[PDB]
Amino acid sequence: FPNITNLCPFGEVFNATRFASVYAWNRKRISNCVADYSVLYNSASFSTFKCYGVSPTKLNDLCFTNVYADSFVIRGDEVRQIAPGQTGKIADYNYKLPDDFTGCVIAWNSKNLDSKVGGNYNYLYRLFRKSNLKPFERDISTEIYQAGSTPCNGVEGFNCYFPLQSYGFQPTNGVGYQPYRVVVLSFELLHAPATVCGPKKST
């Protein structure tokens, strides 16, 4: 590329020092740039690289209105859930993708980044809700979960729980309990002039 080229900030998203937790998933909007997907291809870091709606071999070839990069930390057994039509704890109550989802999902093992001797308890996942999340909904409420018939207004106790529970990341965790950083690149197809396009020799 020329030096004067305006590339998209995929480096900032994927190489951020600290990710938000899934319950409060972080959204960065990417617009009016040239999307270099060469940074993503052949990476020796990623353990999960899937795309929905588009083939990843034709990413350079496509233009979009906007690209939304969502980022959060999950455990190994729960990487399954960040996909269309998937169900679970983090899929229902934390972060939900549409069934008609057009985008890509990338994840890598961040064992040596997010685990800590003694345990890192800075990543919060929601465990309870009264209702399942809509696609691309974000719940950050601190309302006490009422599981019983009796109200417990603003007080935790029996049949009443704090909705947000802390992930425990130890360096000696099993594969499925080890932390994984996840980036969800969502491509937008709005009826407006496209801004994010691949290399000039492609599109």
Partner: antibody, heavy 126, light 108 residues
Framework: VQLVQSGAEVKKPGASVKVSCKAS????????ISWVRQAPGQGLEWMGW????????NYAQKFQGRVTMTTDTSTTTGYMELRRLRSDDTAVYYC????????????????????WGQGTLVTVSS | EIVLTQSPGTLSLSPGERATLSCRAS???????LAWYQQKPGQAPRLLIY???SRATGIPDRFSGSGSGTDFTLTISRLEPEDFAVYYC????????FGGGTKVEIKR
Amino acid sequence: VQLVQSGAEVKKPGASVKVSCKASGYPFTSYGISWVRQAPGQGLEWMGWISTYNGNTNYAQKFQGRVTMTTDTSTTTGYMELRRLRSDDTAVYYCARDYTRGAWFGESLIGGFDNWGQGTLVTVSS
Amino acid sequence: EIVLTQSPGTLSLSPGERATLSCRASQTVSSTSLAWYQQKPGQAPRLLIYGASSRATGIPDRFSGSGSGTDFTLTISRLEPEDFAVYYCQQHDTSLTFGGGTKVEIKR
């Protein structure tokens, strides 16, 4: 990838110096630029950080009321102007390619100052 | 404000031996926001280690990044004649600060 700097400049106290840092070999708009000064026979001292994208900047406290940084995308050249110079400002000034803070979102990145300039000696004396 | 303290700041070692440089922070620095730098006399500094462990591109096998919390280390497995230089640690956990440096001297 290479960073090239103005060249040694000598000025009186109270005056202004403006060092230029030309960037080539990489998409200029993607990476940010940061400045570090080194007094003779002393350690490195962080000055500030400039985004080549939006122009947002973060300076240290010691330089907050004096230093001003600018970039030009057309020339791929970043500037560092330090006004109200003092005798203790006599140092070698380095520009470096930044992978500690993102240009677009201004959030911390896993890295450091990867590429460095050659440095410009700036002498301030009566 | 975070302060990185490098001691002893002037280390005397015979060539070909292991060099263990120390960088101690005043406050816990996340491993993902601390770096190491080499500077040979009269030259510009170069990045050795970032993210506490990760080597930069054009860096030999000699250099190993380590440490966690407040006490970080830079390990040189074998001191080659070009290695005897000054070394700085750097954090960007809060703002951005450098360490005082550590000159690795040839022990005669």
